[PDB]
Scaffold this motif. Structure first.
Motif, mmCIF file in Angstrom:
data_model
loop_
_atom_site.group_PDB
_atom_site.id
_atom_site.type_symbol
_atom_site.label_atom_id
_atom_site.label_comp_id
_atom_site.label_asym_id
_atom_site.label_seq_id
_atom_site.Cartn_x
_atom_site.Cartn_y
_atom_site.Cartn_z
ATOM 1 N N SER B 65 0.822 -1.216 0.000
ATOM 2 C CA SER B 65 0.000 0.000 0.000
ATOM 3 C C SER B 65 0.864 1.277 0.000
ATOM 4 N N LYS B 66 2.108 1.176 0.507
ATOM 5 C CA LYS B 66 3.054 2.290 0.597
ATOM 6 C C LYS B 66 4.042 2.330 -0.597
ATOM 7 N N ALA B 67 3.618 1.776 -1.762
ATOM 8 C CA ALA B 67 4.395 1.686 -3.008
ATOM 9 C C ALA B 67 4.910 3.032 -3.563
ATOM 10 N N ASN B 68 4.043 4.080 -3.582
ATOM 11 C CA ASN B 68 4.370 5.431 -4.068
ATOM 12 C C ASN B 68 4.805 6.300 -2.879
ATOM 13 N N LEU B 69 6.093 6.198 -2.494
ATOM 14 C CA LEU B 69 6.675 6.912 -1.354
ATOM 15 C C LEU B 69 7.989 7.618 -1.712
ATOM 16 N N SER B 70 8.249 8.782 -1.077
ATOM 17 C CA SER B 70 9.440 9.623 -1.280
ATOM 18 C C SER B 70 10.784 8.897 -1.117
ATOM 19 N N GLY B 71 10.803 7.856 -0.284
ATOM 20 C CA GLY B 71 11.982 7.038 -0.027
ATOM 21 C C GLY B 71 11.696 5.551 -0.102
ATOM 22 N N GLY B 72 11.214 5.107 -1.261
ATOM 23 C CA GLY B 72 10.878 3.711 -1.525
ATOM 24 C C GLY B 72 11.896 3.008 -2.400
ATOM 25 N N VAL B 73 12.251 1.756 -2.036
ATOM 26 C CA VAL B 73 13.241 0.933 -2.756
ATOM 27 C C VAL B 73 12.894 -0.563 -2.861
ATOM 28 N N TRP B 74 12.731 -1.074 -4.109
ATOM 29 C CA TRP B 74 12.439 -2.490 -4.396
ATOM 30 C C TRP B 74 13.679 -3.374 -4.193
ATOM 31 N N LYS B 75 13.599 -4.318 -3.222
ATOM 32 C CA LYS B 75 14.671 -5.270 -2.922
ATOM 33 C C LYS B 75 14.297 -6.721 -3.242
ATOM 34 N N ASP B 76 15.326 -7.544 -3.565
ATOM 35 C CA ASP B 76 15.225 -8.965 -3.897
ATOM 36 C C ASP B 76 15.388 -9.829 -2.652
ATOM 37 N N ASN B 77 14.538 -10.873 -2.525
ATOM 38 C CA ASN B 77 14.549 -11.783 -1.381
ATOM 39 C C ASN B 77 15.367 -13.042 -1.624
ATOM 40 N N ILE B 78 16.664 -12.945 -1.295
ATOM 41 C CA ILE B 78 17.625 -14.026 -1.417
ATOM 42 C C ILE B 78 17.604 -14.848 -0.114
ATOM 43 N N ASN B 79 17.197 -16.124 -0.223
ATOM 44 C CA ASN B 79 17.101 -17.097 0.861
ATOM 45 C C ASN B 79 18.450 -17.284 1.558
ATOM 46 N N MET B 80 18.491 -17.100 2.873
ATOM 47 C CA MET B 80 19.736 -17.245 3.629
ATOM 48 C C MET B 80 19.723 -18.481 4.509
ATOM 49 N N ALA B 81 18.533 -18.869 4.996
ATOM 50 C CA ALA B 81 18.311 -20.066 5.800
ATOM 51 C C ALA B 81 16.993 -20.726 5.420
ATOM 52 N N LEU B 82 16.936 -22.029 5.576
ATOM 53 C CA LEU B 82 15.747 -22.821 5.301
ATOM 54 C C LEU B 82 15.875 -23.957 6.298
ATOM 55 N N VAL B 83 14.996 -23.981 7.302
ATOM 56 C CA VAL B 83 15.056 -24.948 8.395
ATOM 57 C C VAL B 83 13.710 -25.671 8.544
ATOM 58 N N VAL B 84 13.734 -26.988 8.791
ATOM 59 C CA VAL B 84 12.513 -27.775 8.986
ATOM 60 C C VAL B 84 12.413 -28.117 10.455
ATOM 61 N N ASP B 85 11.392 -27.592 11.140
ATOM 62 C CA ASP B 85 11.122 -27.905 12.540
ATOM 63 C C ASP B 85 10.079 -29.013 12.635
ATOM 64 N N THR B 86 10.465 -30.100 13.284
ATOM 65 C CA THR B 86 9.569 -31.231 13.495
ATOM 66 C C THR B 86 9.295 -31.493 15.010
ATOM 67 N N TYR B 87 9.961 -30.714 15.908
ATOM 68 C CA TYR B 87 9.807 -30.803 17.364
ATOM 69 C C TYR B 87 8.475 -30.216 17.742
ATOM 70 N N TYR B 88 8.165 -29.034 17.179
ATOM 71 C CA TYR B 88 6.878 -28.354 17.343
ATOM 72 C C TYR B 88 6.052 -28.833 16.148
ATOM 73 N N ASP B 89 4.791 -28.370 16.007
ATOM 74 C CA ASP B 89 3.936 -28.719 14.872
ATOM 75 C C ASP B 89 4.712 -28.392 13.593
ATOM 76 N N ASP B 90 5.049 -29.446 12.810
ATOM 77 C CA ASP B 90 5.831 -29.427 11.570
ATOM 78 C C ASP B 90 5.716 -28.137 10.822
ATOM 79 N N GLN B 91 6.864 -27.471 10.632
ATOM 80 C CA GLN B 91 6.943 -26.178 9.956
ATOM 81 C C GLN B 91 8.288 -25.902 9.299
ATOM 82 N N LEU B 92 8.229 -25.221 8.152
ATOM 83 C CA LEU B 92 9.404 -24.803 7.419
ATOM 84 C C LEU B 92 9.686 -23.354 7.816
#
Lengths: 14, 500, 219
Positions: B65-92
């Motif tokens: 919603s804040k797309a048209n802003l005086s100090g707005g910058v489009w950044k890329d989402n580069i995956n740094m971690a990917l962890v599978v938790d199975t101790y708690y209700d199974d989640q990535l």
């Protein structure tokens, strides 16, 4: 304690 | 001439791979692809970016919603971690470069492992207690190594972050940290101030620290780094960090350098590392039991007084029992990049942070066979009494070779996988009677390579096939050179070549 | 009467619950101790409120002299208080079950604590959840076959569905009435999620360790 009653409340009124 | 194996081409680069419940989870730029184990077909995907950055649009709070802003910058989402938790209700648990390296838990619906979009929660809890800290700020966009361990009934996260001078108001990152995730799953938390060890702000740029690999073994956490030899030093080092595997903090912290010599030329920069058990033959030659955890590391020569690799590779094995024996021996310095190189702590004698004076040296097991290539990936496995190494090139070549000191070995598998370099991040899956597969990333392609059989497909004619090195166990099966089990017909020989 | 409730304070902030089993001894959990520097610890007795607000004629505040850790399995710890707690109308001990004992299934229990409540403006007053004893076998299944229980563990299902202990509740007791008498049967420990509907909670069987507990507390 999630979903508990306060200490002073009896078992039967929960 | 190349091989036809299950492959998958993503629309963006692949950063991290995870294998969970017959599903391959890929960590890609702006996406989390979800493939099927058997055929590498995209079953699902989750759009993680691009994400818009604003000095007021905080982490875990959307601002499309804040797309048209005086100090707005489009950044890329580069995956740094990917962890599978199975101790708690199974989640990535997934972490990206953006949002100040915040993580997010993708809860899996009870019967659909491929559903990554339904339940998605952003791990952020505004720090009221001390607004000077950020435990929900895990990962750095520079470099990050995350290690999950269930310990004392909690899911602890050991983190290795690459930093720079970029100072942050109320949201900083830590060099080496241990945080436990709250049972409310809404935030993380450092137990004590001991829980982190950072590079002094003076050194943040002068001293870049690359965290190559992290692993847990024998009740200890271990980190493998690429840093400078000393603060004033112009040249680069490979180190082995180790600390008592506890929840409350980083206790009995120690760092020692590792040396991969070639008998005295040094391959000073670790490109990849893999920890596995040794096959009987090599076990004997390195002085290890069949049940000894072994750190196999692929090293490279650095350009004089630089950190960039030279296309001159090597590979040496560090049995962790021996690595531990070095740490349990008494001389020793103070951690110069964390403490002050001049401070009172350094001169005295859990509480302290040790830096080791000498290194642990090992000779290239391949005896210089790779001194003219750039090895970027390693994965080891056991075949009978053999120890085979899966190796990736900076040129995009994948090779399988027998690890032995008792005479050098030529690779039995060697072919171009892609044009793009091979990713250090690998996956080895094991199946009954030593035959599984590896998962090899080459840019936007992930390939499913079997552990034993590729050696056989390199022979076009029965006569060529019949004179293959015996260990590959190659035979002719009517019109193809394959392993006994791969021949479903009955016409399997290593002795006869009928007329054609 | 909740005289046996103890609030463990680590760096002047409440970290855990505990239970006064004898004048100078508090039974709690290993998770409650981020540091080996006893200086940072204080035990509050006589309190109802987490910040010890309306409690001042009752409130007893003791220093921690010792940390006796229970067997490798148990996440138990016995605290020796620097001076005996004075047993008045507001401060009292809690009985322990005997070594060779068990409690019938569906026996009514309570978990007490100043922990997370999921409420917006929590008043800091002591809370209580009503639970019922469950067989270890039927509890292992109820967990979706993910966790298998030892003889050192104890199960208790919730009477009000979404209820159960959380962050800040650890070390606190699981009180049930064995032979018409309030006894500490379990010690709250971290679980696999805070208050999940229909999933029961694992506590630690105090009876399993009663030999060890009496070995320490009986000097």
């Amino acid at each position: 304690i999630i979903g508990g009653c306060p200490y002073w409340m009896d078992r039967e009124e929960c | 001439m190349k091989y036809q194996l299950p492959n998958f081409t993503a629309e963006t680069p692949i950063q991290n791979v995870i294998l969970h419940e017959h599903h391959i989870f890929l960590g890609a730029t702006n996406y989390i692809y979800v493939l099927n184990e058997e055929d590498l077909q995209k079953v699902a995907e989750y759009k993680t970016g691009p994400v818009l950055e604003h000095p007021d649009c905080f982490p875990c709070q959307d601002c499309s919603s804040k797309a048209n802003l005086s100090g707005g910058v489009w950044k890329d989402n580069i995956n740094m971690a990917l962890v599978v938790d199975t101790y708690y209700d199974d989640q990535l648990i997934s972490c990206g470069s953006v949002n100040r390296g915040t993580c997010q838990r993708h809860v899996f619906p009870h019967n659909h492992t491929a559903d990554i979009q339904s339940e998605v929660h952003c791990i952020f809890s505004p720090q009221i207690e001390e607004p000077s800290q950020c435990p929900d700020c895990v990962v750095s966009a520079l470099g990050a190594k995350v290690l999950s361990s269930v310990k004392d009934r909690f899911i602890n996260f050991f983190v290795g972050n690459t930093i720079n001078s970029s100072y942050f108001p109320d949201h900083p990152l830590h060099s080496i940290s241990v945080r436990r995730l709250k049972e409310t799953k809404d935030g993380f938390m450092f137990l004590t101030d001991q829980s982190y060890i950072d590079v002094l702000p003076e050194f943040r740029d002068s001293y870049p620290i690359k965290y190559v690999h992290a692993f847990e073994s024998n009740n200890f956490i271990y980190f493998l780094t690429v840093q400078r030899e000393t603060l004033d030093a112009q040249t680069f080092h490979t180190r082995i960090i180790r600390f008592c595997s506890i929840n409350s903090g980083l206790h009995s912290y120690m760092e020692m350098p590792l040396e991969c010599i070639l008998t005295k030329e040094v391959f000073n920069i670790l490109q990849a590392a893999y920890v596995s058990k040794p096959g009987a033959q090599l076990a004997r030659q390195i002085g290890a039991s069949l049940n000894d955890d072994i750190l196999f590391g692929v090293f490279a020569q650095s350009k004089p007084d630089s950190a960039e690799p030279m296309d001159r590779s090597a590979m040496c094995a560090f049995p962790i029992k021996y690595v531990n024996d070095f740490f349990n021996k008494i001389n020793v310095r103070c951690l110069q990049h964390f403490y002050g190189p001049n401070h009172e702590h350094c001169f005295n004698r859990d509480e302290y942070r040790t830096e080791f004076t000498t290194a642990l040296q090992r000779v290239d097991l391949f005896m210089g066979q790779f001194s003219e290539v750039l090895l970027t990936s390693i994965s080891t496995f056991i075949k009978g009494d053999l120890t085979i190494a899966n190796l990736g090139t900076s040129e995009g070549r994948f090779m399988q070779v027998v690890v032995s000191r008792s005479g050098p070995s030529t690779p039995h598998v060697n072919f171009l996988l892609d044009s793009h370099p091979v990713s250090p991040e690998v996956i080895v899956e094991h199946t009954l009677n030593q035959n599984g597969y590896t998962l090899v990333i080459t840019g936007k392609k992930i390939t499913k390579i079997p552990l034993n059989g590729l050696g056989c497909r390199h022979f076009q004619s029965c006569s060529q096939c019949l004179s293959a090195p015996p260990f590959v166990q190659c035979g002719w099966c009517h019109d193809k050179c394959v392993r006994s089990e791969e021949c479903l017909s009955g016409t399997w020989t290593q002795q006869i070549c009928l007329p054609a | 009467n909740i005289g046996w409730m103890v609030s463990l304070r680590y760096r002047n902030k409440h970290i855990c619950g505990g239970s006064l089993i004898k004048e100078s001894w508090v039974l709690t959990a290993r998770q409650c101790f981020p540091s080996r520097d006893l200086k940072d610890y204080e035990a509050w007795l006589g309190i109802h409120d987490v910040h010890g607000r309306g409690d001042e004629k009752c409130k007893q505040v003791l220093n921690v002299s010792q940390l006796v850790y229970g067997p490798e399995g148990s996440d138990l710890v016995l605290m020796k208080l620097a001076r005996p707690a004075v047993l008045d109308d507001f401060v009292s001990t809690i009985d322990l079950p005997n070594y060779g004992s068990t409690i019938p299934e569906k026996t009514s229990c309570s978990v007490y604590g100043w922990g997370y409540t999921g409420l917006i403006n929590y008043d800091g007053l002591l809370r209580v959840a009503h639970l019922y004893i469950m067989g270890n076998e039927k509890c292992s299944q109820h967990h979706r076959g993910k966790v298998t229980l030892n003889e050192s563990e104890i199960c208790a299902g919730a009477e009000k569905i979404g209820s159960g202990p959380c962050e800040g509740d650890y070390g606190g007791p699981l009180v049930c009435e064995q032979h018409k008498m309030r006894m500490v049967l379990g010690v709250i420990v971290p679980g696999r999620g805070c208050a999940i509907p229909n999933r029961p909670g694992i506590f630690v069987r105090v009876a399993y360790y009663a030999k060890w507990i009496h070995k320490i507390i009986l000097t």
